[PDB]
Write a protein that binds this ligand. Structure first.
Ligand SMILES: Nc1ncnc2c1ncn2[C@@H]1O[C@H](COP(=O)(O)O)[C@@H](O)[C@H]1O
Ligand SMILES: Nc1ncnc2c1ncn2[C@@H]1O[C@H](COP(=O)(O)O)[C@@H](O)[C@H]1O
Ligand SMILES: Nc1ncnc2c1ncn2[C@@H]1O[C@H](COP(=O)(O)O)[C@@H](O)[C@H]1O
Ligand SMILES: Nc1ncnc2c1ncn2[C@@H]1O[C@H](COP(=O)(O)O)[C@@H](O)[C@H]1O
Lengths: 425, 425, 425, 425
């Protein structure tokens, strides 16, 4: 079903649904006061700016952001950086938190029980192709090249699949395909992830990116919402049901990936645990980042906050401040200290004589005089006191703060407030 | 404490808090799928555009909209018509729905238990004067003339009071004042509303508009949040506590009312029941409205939706359509029918041979051919079928639809869908 | 050169250039204080909302509006209704008025000498396909179906051509094509428009819509800007030069026309004279308009001004107001008068006892008591006095106001101010 | 005439008029392709963001920006950073370039002949107090404390005056006042600036900030526009005329100045010559700036451009980059070089082995490998080639580029393009 203009008409006949939804329990306390899509990233972004700017640059300007857990920061972010739309041009970012009445009802029992509470609003959009996006993930995808591959194949559901190492394939949806990219066997979060054919060390995993014939989705959820043994989830209940009827195809991600270096492999990081969050940000600080953010053909839209330039000033002794492979966003004030392999977000104040190495300083952090920081994640608005040392004694950082098994430290206000340090600057 | 520039500095040192909050159980099914602040009004407004445009024109550009019950329409309305702000100029409309975690917690136990869940966010605003607005009400108030009268008197709390007939004074907060506008006796929602001195037929009632010294509010809620017998409400728990310490003054509303005819009385309608909602809209349709909306010195900001002009066309027989004291907003298409004392909102389609009298047609209503409508409220998207008659047989309109004691009919999709009529045009 | 995704990539590689430019000397005094693209139309639109909303809905979000003559209203309109863009997403509406220095230089000698003054700014956009739009015209075109037909054919320039009656073909660019849609003979504004083959009563006319290979445009203007005998115009100088090299193809407009009734003919009105301006607006007032503006698949974006609903009130005698095939936009206040086949724009006040027939009342017009209006165009802010009669005595309307040869009257403030009538309400 | 609420009503009854207007011929080639109000400043600002954010924070939300010379950048900047207004709330930034018709007329003969061409538009605003702002100047003023001092005194015109050294008082309007702040003697740009009484080394100078009774301004310009010997300027023609009638008062700037350190003197820099432009930017780079831009009670609004964080990377040799009292805005990429006392604007790329000292690098500058820069101003988009040396040989920098008498160098593309260096990266 190939036509000259089909590539431009299908995004307009389409509607995206971001399951901002729940959290990552594996992100520890990075999330205790926010949703995982609203975790900061990149010096100025949040994670949901990746699953939203790919809808825009793919022509999909009708989005539906499903928010349940700690969404105040998320909703405020959509309000301030994603509310430039005009509903008359057939474009909008509708927020669909669970509707509360009688004071204790409607709380979204599953991933697919959140698209069923809102199934009277989504019909009104009159959409033929429903993209189902997990927006707690980081990528650069073109969903107007996955929609075609969906329309050429004559598919009803189209799961974006990409291979990953079998070691981490127990956290995603492993499938198995054929010569025509038809899903034969799908199993969600196995304990023994089956390998690919010819690639024993890797498994063909679902990314959480389903494209759906809308006439099939509505008839599949209402045919699923009445099920008493269902767990109400896309992976755990529906995609096996579609697969077992043979109506589920697989769309390889390398085809519909936007990357500035065609020789490279596609970039996917779901920032699962704490360690991959830290490792994902500092990749932007290296010399050749795996993720291009100086790209003008696929830009990422965010809250363009008004901040003054990054100021570097002399310390108390009149000396210089040295920097090496670091990002200093706007608002920062670094008073003559050494910053290495670091990422400083907005409004980070760093007083004199500090040493900062492989750190990520989320916004409004105040580092006090003579602090040493190594392999850490400093949370929002943390007021680090004077002479604090972090990342040199693992036995003394595990009983103060949180310390992952790989050596990454996390600092929060509650962790610092419990040691007596006042966090009200 | 009078200074030359005090009238301009206090709104900037101020923060408004709209308790969009719960519903009006007395509005019947007008509200079953929306909050009372999001009830439509005026052809193009919602009720919360009144409690928000008075903050803007009073200089208060920092608002806090507390939303709990059926807020999807409300939040979408704030997003599309109240998201032109820039957070750098010290201005914003923050939405503060209850934060949900663990799937069944944090549901706002009272009016004053919603400003206590959010008391870690409001401290961050660093506001000295907290205006506490009930935003389910209709008025034109200047809160930079109530803030001064609060600062001149040296008050800690300042309740906007206005007299109302003793008949309807059992639904508001009746107080009693002295020569210096100090509250002596406050009682919330009495069964026998005490009268005023010298005006036995009227009672001095609270409007739900408290101005607070912020250093006193925070210390009053935390001193109240620990109370086990409290009901967590401003009227029912706190304002008596302030009153009994003698720190509560009364600010007359006629002083800080914006009205284009100084000879008139101040305009306050809380659209309590169904009958006062209908009566309040048609007041705009009369020749001399009590509420001026063609006023340019105190304009009301709303979702400026892009709609085509109001089209009037000839009916099936080539005849004319007559109109008398009516409002026809944009999008409407009236095919040669008689419309009298009516208010038609956006996108109301009225086919031929209809007769419409003292009606209010909320948006996207479709009236079919040969319909007669008298003293009714047609809800959103109601698809009235052909030959329907409403408002001529009270015994036949009470057992089909809802009919108030005063004779006002209300029509909803669920009422029409239950009689077999398909509402999917 | 056909590829799966070519239909979506070419608008993003493209840049549109609207020649808002000069005026229509044939519009008489409708234009004396504005550019022809800023002439009002449709109850709420201006003409340049047609040549701009077709770029948006065609994916072309980089526009260049070239303005020279009386552009204050035009520029203010772009500012208030076309400034929702974010320059980071590769989208903008750049205004390119002639750059003034030394107080009397740089005044745009021709249509193609306005794209040559600005040829240092347009290179910076890095565009491969330059659409050249005359934006003083009314249509609904999809320029992402003309760009392909340009890329399939391997063309360098692609002129959108559509047939018109030979009677009015002396005002457009008549061409002649072959079996492959190659322009053979082009002549601009002939005195004897050549006819089509097989259609002696019609001529194949240029619409003023050129698509250009950018590498060819820049090399064609700089190769033309040095010409001393050139008149610096697209039609009169360049398109013959391209044609005579055989690099100019013709793109039929019926292919790339957006119309809701496929059985109909394409809609093109350049509102040439006064009579076609009046006739073009009232077409929207008829029962079946030739131009669909209740279309949601190709909406027109404009200045969504905040106006109250259209109010109809009783006259001084308590009587009704009748309407027949008319458009009443927002702000209007019609006090019980008869309005027929009319178009009332925003904020038109019509006092009692008026009779209005086949009129067009541009905004902020005040009609006084007992006025009769027939076949007229009332300009902006005209304060028609009491008892004025228009359109019943042609000999008495030609020596007061302007009256076309076909019987259309035009009323301006200067025409009314010269008869003594004060126009300062 | 003192009333409780007068401080808040007068800005709303007011209208500001920024004379963005002509250029500074003394800024040399900084301006050759832009107006002086659009000169960059501060890392991210332009100069007209100072004369506009003081209207906003002073409550004056109706501005009129008069633009004549090279306004493409200025108008584009107003469009993208000052077009968040809604005309219904009585707020706007109207652009008033001279209206062009017949191709060579209407070119604004003087400063006060630009408010007379536009005197039919300004009457429509219905403003009582017209602030007349020169917007090519840098300050932090509160015009709602100058308007009162104007209304208390019962003045007709109110000139903001502040003392400056008699050495530079030949470029401003020197006046002389009395005990009641009444102007006695005004003379514009004298050759021998008269001194103050008791301060022989300083002169009481006009800042170009006139507040006017609107009923007097309109009657003063029309009474001046007919004068054949007038030069059509506020200083040179009108203010002497008002002064000689005794209707002109003087408003001291230290009263209505917003400064975070009350012990300091008011900040006024008109960035007259090249040397004061350079000296004015680096003041922001010092440790204690004279101009506070980290102030939240009087923020400056600008084009909040979306730029990535400031990246510092290692040079070709793996080494560190050192910084000392510098501002690095967003977009910059500094590859391991030394930056001192500098100001880098957006998108400045600095390759390896550079040395940059007391420089100002306007946006999109590319510094090549092994460059030494000292006491310079690098203009927009300058592509400095490899091994260039600037600021070490004054005899070799005066015959290449422009070099002021005080030692400041200025680098432009035309200066670099004339030495053969290609500026097309
Ligand atoms: N300056 C601050 N100090 C303390 N908490 C903050 C600050 N800014 C934001 N927060 C809170 O930090 C939590 C996470 O917000 P965010 O980091 O924006 O996702 C929320 O509870 C915010 O209200
Ligand atoms: N065209 C429509 N048809 C049916 N329901 C609608 C329509 N538009 C809005 N609604 C719903 O009507 C309820 C009230 O919305 P509102 O009238 O906008 O407050 C909500 O549940 C909306 O989703
Ligand atoms: N209410 C009004 N009264 C008189 N002239 C106006 C009014 N509104 C706009 N204009 C002027 O009418 C001319 C045409 O403006 P427009 O009709 O908006 O293109 C311009 O000179 C405007 O400044
Ligand atoms: N990247 C660039 N390269 C060359 N010229 C530019 C660039 N950006 C802006 N300009 C021009 O530089 C002049 C000054 O612009 P601005 O610096 O923005 O005031 C104008 O003629 C602009 O069009």
């Amino acid at each position: 079903n190939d036509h000259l203009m089909l590539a431009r008409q299908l995004p307009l006949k389409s509607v995206a649904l971001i399951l901002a939804g729940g959290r990552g329990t594996r992100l520890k306390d990075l999330t205790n006061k926010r949703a995982k899509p609203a975790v900061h990233f990149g010096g100025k972004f949040r994670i949901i700016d990746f699953a939203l700017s790919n809808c825009i640059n793919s022509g999909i300007r009708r989005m539906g952001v499903i928010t349940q857990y700690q969404s105040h920061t998320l909703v405020q972010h959509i309000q301030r950086g994603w509310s430039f739309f005009n509903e008359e041009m057939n474009e909008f970012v509708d927020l669909l938190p669970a509707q509360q009445r009688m004071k204790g009802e409607n709380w979204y029992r599953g991933t697919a029980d959140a698209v069923t509470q809102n199934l009277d609003i989504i019909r009104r959009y009159k959409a033929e192709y429903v993209v189902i996006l997990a927006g707690d993930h980081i990528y650069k995808q073109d969903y107007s090249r996955m929609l075609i591959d969906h329309v050429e194949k004559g598919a009803r559901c189209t799961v974006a699949c990409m291979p990953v190492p079998i070691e981490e394939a127990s956290a995603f949806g492993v499938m198995a395909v054929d010569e025509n990219d038809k899903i034969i066997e799908f199993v969600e979060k196995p304990a023994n992830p089956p390998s690919m054919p010819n690639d024993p060390s890797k498994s063909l995993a679902s990314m959480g990116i389903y494209v759906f014939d809308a006439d099939y989705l509505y008839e599949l959820l209402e045919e699923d919402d009445r099920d008493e043994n269902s767990s109400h989830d896309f992976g755990k209940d529906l995609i096996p049901k579609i697969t077992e009827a043979g109506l589920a195809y697989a769309h390889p991600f390398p085809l519909s990936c936007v990357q500035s270096d065609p020789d490279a492999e596609p970039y996917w990081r779901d920032v699962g645990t704490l360690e991959a969050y830290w490792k994902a940000n500092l990749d932007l600080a290296s010399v050749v980042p795996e993720l291009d953010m100086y790209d003008r053909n696929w830009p990422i839209r965010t809250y363009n906050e008004s901040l003054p330039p990054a100021k570097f000033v002399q310390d108390r002794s009149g000396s210089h401040g040295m920097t090496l492979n670091s990002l200093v966003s706007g608002g920062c004030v670094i008073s003559g200290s050494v910053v290495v392999q670091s990422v400083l977000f907005s409004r980070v104040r760093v007083n004199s004589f500090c040493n900062i190495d492989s750190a990520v300083l989320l916004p409004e952090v105040w580092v006090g005089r003579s602090c040493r920081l190594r392999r850490c994640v400093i949370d929002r608005a943390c007021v680090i006191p004077e002479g604090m040392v972090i990342g040199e004694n693992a036995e003394e950082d595990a009983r103060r703060f949180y310390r992952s098994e790989e050596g990454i430290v996390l600092v929060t206000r509650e962790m610092l407030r419990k040691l007596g340090h006042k966090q009200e600057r």
